[PDB]
Design an enzyme around this catalytic site. Sequence first.
Site, PDB file in Angstrom:
ATOM      1  N   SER A  69       3.741   0.320   2.965  1.00  0.00           N
ATOM      2  CA  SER A  69       4.853  -0.258   2.328  1.00  0.00           C
ATOM      3  C   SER A  69       5.752   0.724   1.507  1.00  0.00           C
ATOM      4  CB  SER A  69       4.718  -1.537   1.850  1.00  0.00           C
ATOM      5  OG  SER A  69       3.726  -1.374   0.661  1.00  0.00           O
ATOM      6  N   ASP A 114       7.659  -0.436  -4.939  1.00  0.00           N
ATOM      7  CA  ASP A 114       7.349  -1.241  -4.010  1.00  0.00           C
ATOM      8  C   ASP A 114       6.324  -2.268  -4.543  1.00  0.00           C
ATOM      9  OD1 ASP A 114       6.353  -2.368  -1.310  1.00  0.00           O
ATOM     10  OD2 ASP A 114       4.779  -0.763  -1.471  1.00  0.00           O
ATOM     11  N   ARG A 143      -3.854  -1.536  -5.172  1.00  0.00           N
ATOM     12  CA  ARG A 143      -3.445  -3.176  -4.796  1.00  0.00           C
ATOM     13  C   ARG A 143      -3.616  -3.599  -3.512  1.00  0.00           C
ATOM     14  NH1 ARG A 143       2.620  -5.200  -6.462  1.00  0.00           N
ATOM     15  NH2 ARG A 143       1.595  -5.184  -8.406  1.00  0.00           N
ATOM     16  N   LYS A 154      -8.783   2.491  -1.497  1.00  0.00           N
ATOM     17  CA  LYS A 154      -8.348   2.603  -0.284  1.00  0.00           C
ATOM     18  C   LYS A 154      -8.742   3.765   0.420  1.00  0.00           C
ATOM     19  CE  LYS A 154      -4.412  -0.265  -1.662  1.00  0.00           C
ATOM     20  NZ  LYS A 154      -3.146  -0.838  -1.194  1.00  0.00           N
ATOM     21  N   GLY A 170      -2.102  -1.408   6.531  1.00  0.00           N
ATOM     22  CA  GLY A 170      -1.996  -1.972   7.971  1.00  0.00           C
ATOM     23  C   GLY A 170      -3.226  -3.115   7.433  1.00  0.00           C
ATOM     24  N   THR A 204       0.882  -1.174   0.173  1.00  0.00           N
ATOM     25  CA  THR A 204       0.054   0.017  -0.211  1.00  0.00           C
ATOM     26  C   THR A 204       0.937   1.290   0.036  1.00  0.00           C
ATOM     27  OG1 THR A 204      -1.994  -1.120   1.022  1.00  0.00           O
ATOM     28  CG2 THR A 204      -1.491   1.319   1.334  1.00  0.00           C
ATOM     29  N   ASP A 260      -2.746   4.068  -3.904  1.00  0.00           N
ATOM     30  CA  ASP A 260      -2.671   3.019  -4.903  1.00  0.00           C
ATOM     31  C   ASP A 260      -3.947   1.827  -4.819  1.00  0.00           C
ATOM     32  OD1 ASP A 260      -1.378   1.402  -2.647  1.00  0.00           O
ATOM     33  OD2 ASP A 260      -1.243  -0.112  -4.213  1.00  0.00           O
ATOM     34  N   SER A 285       2.540  -2.246  -3.430  1.00  0.00           N
ATOM     35  CA  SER A 285       1.663  -1.439  -4.151  1.00  0.00           C
ATOM     36  C   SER A 285       1.850  -1.686  -5.701  1.00  0.00           C
ATOM     37  CB  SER A 285       2.122   0.025  -3.782  1.00  0.00           C
ATOM     38  OG  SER A 285       2.633   0.151  -2.603  1.00  0.00           O
TER      39      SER A 285
HETATM   40 MG   LIG Z   1       3.875  -8.295 -10.274  1.00  0.00          MG
END
Ligand SMILES: [Mg+2]
Lengths: 219, 123, 222, 226, 195, 195, 233, 196, 196, 204
Positions: free
Chosen positions: D129, D166, D19, D33, D47, D1, D17, D169
Amino acid sequence: KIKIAHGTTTLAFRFQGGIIVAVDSRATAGNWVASQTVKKVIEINPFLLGTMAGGAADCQFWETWLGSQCRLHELREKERISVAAASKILSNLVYQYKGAGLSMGTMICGYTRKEGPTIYYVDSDGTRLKGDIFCVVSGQTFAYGVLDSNYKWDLSVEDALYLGKRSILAAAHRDAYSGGSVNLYHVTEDGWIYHGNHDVGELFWKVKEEEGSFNNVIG
Amino acid sequence: DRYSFSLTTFSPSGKLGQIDYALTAVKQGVTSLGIKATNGVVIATEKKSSSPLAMSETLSKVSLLTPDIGAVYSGMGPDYRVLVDKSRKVAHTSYKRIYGEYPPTKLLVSEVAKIMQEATQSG
Amino acid sequence: QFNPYGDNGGTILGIAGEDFAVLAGDTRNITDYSINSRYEPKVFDCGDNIVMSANGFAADGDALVKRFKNSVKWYHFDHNDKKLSINSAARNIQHLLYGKRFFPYYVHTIIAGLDEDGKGAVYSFDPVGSYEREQCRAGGAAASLIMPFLDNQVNFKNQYEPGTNGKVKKPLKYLSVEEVIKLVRDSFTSATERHIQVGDGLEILIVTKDGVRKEFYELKRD
Amino acid sequence: TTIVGVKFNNGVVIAADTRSTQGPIVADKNCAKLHRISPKIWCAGAGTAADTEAVTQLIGSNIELHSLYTSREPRVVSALQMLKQHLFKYQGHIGAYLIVAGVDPTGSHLFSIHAHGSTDVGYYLSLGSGSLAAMAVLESHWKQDLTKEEAIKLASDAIQAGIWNDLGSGSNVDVCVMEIGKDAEYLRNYLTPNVREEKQKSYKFPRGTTAVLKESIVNICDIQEE
Amino acid sequence: MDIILGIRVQDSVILASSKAVTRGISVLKDSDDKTRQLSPHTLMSFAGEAGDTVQFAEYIQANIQLYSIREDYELSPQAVSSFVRQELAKSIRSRRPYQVNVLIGGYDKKKNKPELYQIDYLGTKVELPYGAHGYSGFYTFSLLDHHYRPDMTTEEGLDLLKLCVQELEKRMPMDFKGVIVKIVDKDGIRQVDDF
Amino acid sequence: MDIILGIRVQDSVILASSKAVTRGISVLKDSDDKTRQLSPHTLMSFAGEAGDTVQFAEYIQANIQLYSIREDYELSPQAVSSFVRQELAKSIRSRRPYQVNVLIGGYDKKKNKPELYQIDYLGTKVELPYGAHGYSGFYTFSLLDHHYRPDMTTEEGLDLLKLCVQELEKRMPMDFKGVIVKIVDKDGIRQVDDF
Amino acid sequence: TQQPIVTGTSVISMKYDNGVIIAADNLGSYGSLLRFNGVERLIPVGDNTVVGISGDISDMQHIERLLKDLVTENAYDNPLADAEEALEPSYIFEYLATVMYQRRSKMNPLWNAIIVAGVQSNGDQFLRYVNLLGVTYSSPTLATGFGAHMANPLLRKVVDRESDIPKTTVQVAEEAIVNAMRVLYYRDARSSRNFSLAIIDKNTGLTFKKNLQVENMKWDFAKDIKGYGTQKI
Amino acid sequence: TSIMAVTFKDGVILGADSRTTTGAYIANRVTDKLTRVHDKIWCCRSGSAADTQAIADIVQYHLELYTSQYGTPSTETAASVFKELCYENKDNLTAGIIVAGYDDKNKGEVYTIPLGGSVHKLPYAIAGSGSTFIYGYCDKNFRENMSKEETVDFIKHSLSQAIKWDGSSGGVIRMVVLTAAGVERLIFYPDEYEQL
Amino acid sequence: TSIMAVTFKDGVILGADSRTTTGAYIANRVTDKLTRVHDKIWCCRSGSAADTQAIADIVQYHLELYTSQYGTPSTETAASVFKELCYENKDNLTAGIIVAGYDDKNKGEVYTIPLGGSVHKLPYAIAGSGSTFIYGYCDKNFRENMSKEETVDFIKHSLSQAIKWDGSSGGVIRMVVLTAAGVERLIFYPDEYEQL
Amino acid sequence: SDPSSINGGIVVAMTGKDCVAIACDLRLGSQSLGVSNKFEKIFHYGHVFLGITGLATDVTTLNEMFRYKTNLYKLKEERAIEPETFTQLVSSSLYERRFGPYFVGPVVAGINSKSGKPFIAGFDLIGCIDEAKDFIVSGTASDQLFGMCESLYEPNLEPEDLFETISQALLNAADRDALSGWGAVVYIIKKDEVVKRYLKMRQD
Ligand SMILES: [Mg+2]
Ligand SMILES: [Mg+2]
Ligand SMILES: [Mg+2]
C-alpha cells in the site's frame, strides 16, 4: 445501514385502567450497540403516545408533525382530536410516500371519552388497524402480547404496568437487539403518565430472584 | 511391477531371513561408533577410501539430518545415502511444517525406523 | 457509475459536564489510504454558545454546518436577535437533515452547548435527522473503540464497590472539565494506536457560560 | 504495508514497516514482515499475510532440503523459480507479493514476485500500500554504486515515506543487510519513530471492582499417583 | 392468500371474508372485516396489497355515498361495478398501481334480482353465480360447480358456503382465522350472527 | 416453518413435533411423525429440507442400531449427540449439504438423568433444559424462560408444553395441524395418548 | 452521471515562505492514448490566482469559461476592479467549490480535481483543493491523482507542517516541485515530460513558466538489467 | 507494451519498450521483454507477464532437452513449441509472443503467435498495445534485405512512435541482434529516440 | 471511418473514406462524410451517423442565421457551435467531429471535437476508427506550410493506410480543398490509392 | 449470512507479570435469537489454553481436532505441548484449509513450563499469527475489545490486578455488542495454578 432502525421491543395493550405502553431503549447499527438510552415512545401530545419501530428518524419526524396537526385540529374545532382521526392523519401521510422507502411500524395510543382507550397500529405500507394489543419483537409485529395471550382485561394499573415491564424483559433477554432499559407509560382519559426508566440489567436479577423465573440463567 | 508380495517371510524356525542377511551385510561394514558425554555426543567412523585417486572428502559417511541431529552408518553406503535423503525430508514433512520446529532425536529416529520396518514387510 | 458519496474518515467525541460541554475531533482528513490534510478542522463555533461537527462525507458535513450557521443568522433576523437554545438548534438540525431524507447528508452530527438551565448538553443525530440528548457520544471511524471506554470511565458501568461483591455499584461523581479532557485525550490516543484513519491532531472546543475556548493536542502522524 | 529492496556495492538491503491491519484496525503494532527463506536469502511480504508466511516457509523448507542434497549454499534464483512456479500454479489465489533479496556464491540478487507468478529484476523495488510513497523517495535519491550505509539510509527513508503518508503502514522500520562474504544482519526495529506518549491517567482498578459468581481451581496437572 | 368468497342465491348475495391480517410470519389481526358498504343494497369485499385495499375500498365508498346524496338515488349494482372496474383499470398503467381484488355483492331493487360481480386488480370484471379471489379460488370453484343450484335459498347458500370454509380450513397451509359472512338482500346488508 | 419443541424435566424428556408436511401452498400430510427411535432410551426429532430430514434421521438410526448389535450396548445420549453433530458438521462443506435441524431427547441409565441436545444443520450442539427449531423458537423460549423449573414432574412438563402449543396455534400464520408428543424416561419411549 | 473522456493527470502544489507554487503536465489523454500534448491545465485568474485542474478536459474548458466570465462580471459597475474589489483566490475557490458541490448534488458532476493556488490581499498564501464530489481541504502541500500518492510524500519532506513554510525559500520549493514532476514522469503512464509551472509570490507577483521539460533523468542503469530472473545475457 | 521483430540481410532484430504497468502505475520502467529460449532463438513477450514468463521458461526447458538429444533446434521448431502451449491452453492464457531466430541454413526468421495460439511466419511482426499506432508507419517504411543500421533505425523510429502515443509503452528501447556474428544487445534512452 | 483535416500554405484539406457499416455489413460503400455547414466551413463526421447528421444540420442552421445578422462566421465560431451541442448533450451523443474552414484573415484552421465535446485547435487532426493505425505515419510525415499537391499526397497516403488496416474504413477517398480560390472536391478510387 | 457473526461471541487474552489471562463471553445465538448462555469458548490441552470465536460448529470441531492432535503429540513426545509449539500447530492446521477455511478467530494463552515466559497469540481464519506482547482480541466485538484493551492495559500487572483489567475489558466491550454477553469466564493462569472465575453481568 446509515439510518438508525428499530425492529424490536415496543408493546401497547388496552385494559380496564386505559392503555399500557412499554418499550426497550436499545439502538443497534448491525451488531454495534449505538445506544442503550433511546426513547422509543414519542410523546405526540399530553394525551397521545406513539411507539418508534422502523426508521427512528421517520417515526420521530412524522409523529412530531402529527402532534402539530393534532394541535391545529384543536384550535380549528375547539375539541380534542379522536385517536381514529390522529392515526388516520399519519396513515394517510405515509400512504402518499408509499414506495419511496419510509419505514414505520407504530402504535398510536390515546384515551378519549368518545372512543375510550384506543390503539391504532400504523404501517409505512399504509396499514391502519385498531387492536386491544400490539407488540414488535425483532422486526415482527404481533397482536398477542409476548407472554400469555389471555392476560386480563380486569387487571390493576400496578399489575398491568408490571406485565408490560416483564414482557419487555422477556424480549430483552432473548432478543440480541432488544435491551438497555424499559420505559413505562400509563394512558388515561385525562392524559398519559410516565412510570419511569428501569435498567434491564438490575431488573433481570430482581425479577429472577422475586419471580423465581430464568432458572436456566446462573446469578 | 508384479512383486506385490513380501520378499521377507518367516522361516519354519521363526527367523526373518532377509533381516538376518541384512545384519550380516552390516557386520562386513566398516566400524562406526557413538559415545554420549554429559555436555555432548560424538559419532565416528573410518573413511575406507576405495581408491587413492578417489577424493574421500566428497563421500560423507557422517551426515547432518537436522541442525541438532547427525547420523553415521555401518553396511551398504548407497542404502545409507537414500535413508539420509528420506530422513532429512521426513523431519520437515511430518514435523517442522506442522510444529515449526525440528523433531526431537527419538521421534526422527522413530520415523527412520518406520521407513526401514516398511522395507521389511512391503511388497 | 458516479458515486456522489465518499468517506473522509475522522472521529468526533461530545461529552456533557454539569455546567460545561466538550466537542472534540481529530484534524486528519483522508480518502482511502491517502492523507488529504493533517489539519482540516471538523468542529466549528456556530454562534449562540453552540459547537457543531458533521463527521463522515466532508462535503455533506461542510454543507450542513454552513446551512446551520446561516439558520442561526436568520433566526436572529426573524426573532429580534433571540439566542438560539441548544434544544431549538437540535430540532432545527433535524429538519435540515430530514429535508434530504431521500438523498441524505452522509454524516453523523453532534452539537454541544449549555441548555436553558445552564447545564451541559450534547445532541446526537443520524444521517436523516433522528436525534437524542446524550451525556456521551463518539461518532466516526473509531466510535466503537471509544464508546465502551467512556461507558466504563464516565458512567462507571460494570464497576462495583470493593468488598460488596457486586451488590453496590460504584457511585456516579460529577466530572470536572480537566478530568473530561484527560478522558477525551486518552480516547483519541488509544483510537490513534488502533485506527489507521485517526491521528495527526486533536482539536477540542470547550463550552461554558463564559463562552467557547479551543485546545489543540498533537496525535501520532502514522 | 511498505516493503523495499535496495542493491548496494557489495550486497542488497531489504526493509519493511511493522504494522499489521485487519481492515481499518491495527491488529499488531510491532509485526515482523522480514522473513528468512535461507540464512542469506530474506524476503518481505505484502497481500494476504498467511499466504506470504506459508509460501516463504514452504520454499524455505524445500530450499534447505535442496541445499543438503546438492552440498551447496542456496541460490536466490532457486528461491525465485520455486516461488513463481508455485504462485503461477495457484493462478493468483495465493495472495503473496514478495521482494526477494539475498547473497549466494553467484553474487547479490534483488527480485520482486507477484501473486500470479510474474517476477522482475531491479536495483531498487517497493511493494504494498506504501510502495508509491516509498518509490517516490527511491526515484529521488537512488544512484549507482551506493555504499552499505547509503543503501540502509535510502531503504529506511523509503519505509518512513510509507509509514507517514500511507494509512496501511506505520510504527517501526525493520531492516536486513545481506553483504557478500558476510553473515546477513537482521536489524529488528532499526528505527522507532512512533512510540506512544504516556497516558493522562492510570486505569488500574481497585481489587474487587468486578462482580464474581463462582471461583474454582482448574486441574491442568495429569491424573495423580496414590 | 386471504379468503374472499361470494355466492349469489335466488333472492340474496352472501360474501364470506377471512378475518386474518398477516404481514410475513406476523399475524396483525384475527377479527379484520374486509368489507365496505358502498350503498344500502351494495357490499364490496376486498383482498390484496396492504394499505391499498382499505384506501381503494374507502375511496369507492366516499364516491358512491357522494353520488347517493347528490341524486338522492341508489346506483344499481351494475353501475357501481362498472364505476369500480374503471377505477381499477386506470391504476394498471398509473405510476404506482393498486394491487386490490374485489367482490361486489348487490341487490337490484328495480329488477328484484341479486347480483355478484368479480373484479381483479386489472379491472377484469365478470358477473357470476359464485366467485373467489386467491389460492382458495380453484378448490371452492370445483365444489360450487357441483353443489350450486340457481334456485337455492339463503339458508341453502349459507350451508354450501359453510362446507367451503370447512374444506378450506383443512386443505390450506395458512391459518385465515375464520370468516365474517354478510347477506345482501332486498331488506339491506346484515352480518350472519354465527358461522 | 415446522414445529419441534423439547423440554427436559426432572426424570424425563418430552418432544412435541408438528404433524403437518407442506410443500409451497400444498398440504401433503397432517399425521406426519418427525421422530426416529435411535436406541430404546434415545429419541431424535427433525425438521428441515424435504427428503434430507428422513434420509438423515434413518441413516443415523441404522448406524446407532448397528453399534447397539455389535457391542450389545446402548450408547449414552451424549455419545449419540456427538455422533449426530459430527455427521451434520461433515455435510456443511460437502457437495450438497443436509439442511436438517434435530432435537435429541435421551435418558442416561448410567447417570439416571434425562438429557436434551439441540443440534442445527451446521452441527451446532448445545445441551438445554428446553429447545426449539424454527419461527416458533423465540416465542416458546420467552414462555419457557418464565415457567420452567428444573424439578418439574412429567405431568407439569406436559402442561407447560400444552400451553406452548396452544399459544403457538394462535400466533402462527401457518397451520401446523397439531403435534405428536413423546416422553423419554428410564422405562423407554412412549407416545402421549391425548394432547 | 457521465464518464471522463479526454483527461489530464496530476496537479501538484505547495506553500513556501512568500507564496505558492503549482504545476501540471501539458497532456490530454484519451484512455491509454496520449492524444493531445499542447494542453494548458494551469489557468491564471488576474495576477494573484492560478487554478490547476485535472480530470475531464471538456469540463476543464467549461470551468475556464466560468472563470473568464467571473473576471468580466466582477469588473461590471466596479471602479476598484483592479484594486480593493479585485477577485481574491478565496473568492474564486469558494465559487468553484459551490459549483462542484451543486453539480454532484444534481448527480451531474464536473469530473475534475481542482487546486486553487494564490496570494490574498494581506499577503497570506492561499492553497485549497476541491473535486467532483465537492470535497474541500487545505494543506501546506496539495496534489491530485497520482501526485497525491507520489508528489505529496516528497513535498511533505520539505514542508511537513505549517511552521516549515517560513523556512522554505522559492528556490527550494520550485526544486522540490520540479523533482516531483520527474518522479511522476517515471512512474505515471498518463503523464508527460512537458509541463507548466506557476509561482504566485506576494512580492514578485505571478510568474507563469510554459514549455518546461523533465531533465536530469536516470536511465543508464537499464543497460545492466537483463531478463526477469535466471537470464544472464 | 510495444514489441517487434524484423528480418534483414544478416539475420533478425528484436525490439521492445521497457514498461510494465498495473493500471496507470508503472510497476517496472526498465523491464527486459526480449527473452532467450535458445542461443540464437529469442522471443518478444506481450500479455500476462506471469503467462509469457511461464511459457518462455517451459519453451527454454523444451529446447534445452531438444538440443541434448537432436542438436540445435530450428526457429520453426521453437515457434511450434510456443504455439502448442498457447493453442492447447488458450482458455487460461493471455499471451502474444513474437518468436525470432537465426539459423545458418534459413537465416533470419520471424513467427508471431496471437491470442488464439495461431502461427504466422512474417518478414517482420509488430505486437503489444502500442503496435496499433505504427501499423501505417511500419507498412510504409519496411523493406526486405535492409542493412543492420537501416533495421536498427526502422525499429528505433517505429517503437519511438509506439511509445509516444501509447501510455502502456515507454522507458528505454531494448534491441537484440541475431546474426552469424553472434548475439548483440542494444539500448536506446529517451533523450535519443524522443527527438527523432 | 477514417477522417482527417490538414492545414497547408493556401488553406485546409478535409479527407475521409466512404464506408458506413452495420456490424460487418457495409450499409453504404460511397458515403459522403465531408459536410458543408458554411461556404468555406466544412466538417468531417465520425460516430453515430444519426447524431453527426443531426448536429451538422443544426450547426448549418445556426451559421445561416448568424450570416443573415452578423455576416460570414469565423471557423472558431463554427467550432464553438459544434462544441456547445456536443458538450451540453454529451450523455445522449456519440459524435467525433473535425471542423475545418478557410478565412482570408485567419487562413486554414482545423478544430477537433472528441466524444466529451472538448475543443482542440491543431495544425492537422485525424479521427475515426481507422485513425489509430496512422498516428505514427501522420506524426512522422506532416510538415507545416505544405503545397496543395503535397497535402493531397499526405492525406491520400494517410487514409490509404487507415483503410488498409481498418475493416470499418474503405471505398473511395473523398477530399474537399478550402482556399481563397474557392471549394474543390477530389475523389480517389481504390485502384489509385491501394498501389501506393 | 457472514459465517463469523451468525453465533456471535468474543475472546480476549492478556499478559501480566509471570502470568497470562484469557477470557470469553458465554453466548451462543442464531443471529438475533439467544440460544445458550453456557457456550464456553476457552479450552485447555495440558497447560496451553485456546479460545475460539466465530462459527460455533467450527469452534467445537477445532477443539475436538486440537484435543486429538495434542493427545497424539503427548503420547509420542512423552511431554505436554508448549504454547509456542501449539501456536504453530494451530497455524499449520488452519492454513491446510486455505481455500475452505474454518470461520474462527483462535487465541492461544499459556506459560512455557521450562522458561516460565508468559505467551499469547492470535490468528486470522487461515492461520496468520499475531504474536503481540500485550493483548489479543477476537470476535464480533473485536473493535470494542481493541478500544478497551488499548486504554485499560498496562504491562507487568500482578495476577489479581490483571483479572480486574481483562474482566472490565470483556464486560464493557460485550455490552456494546448485540451478539456477545449472557455471562463471561476469566482464566488467571500462573506457572502451576489456574483460577477460573464466572463474572456477573447484564443478561440482555
Ligand atoms: Mg492512526
Ligand atoms: Mg508513452
Ligand atoms: Mg448484548
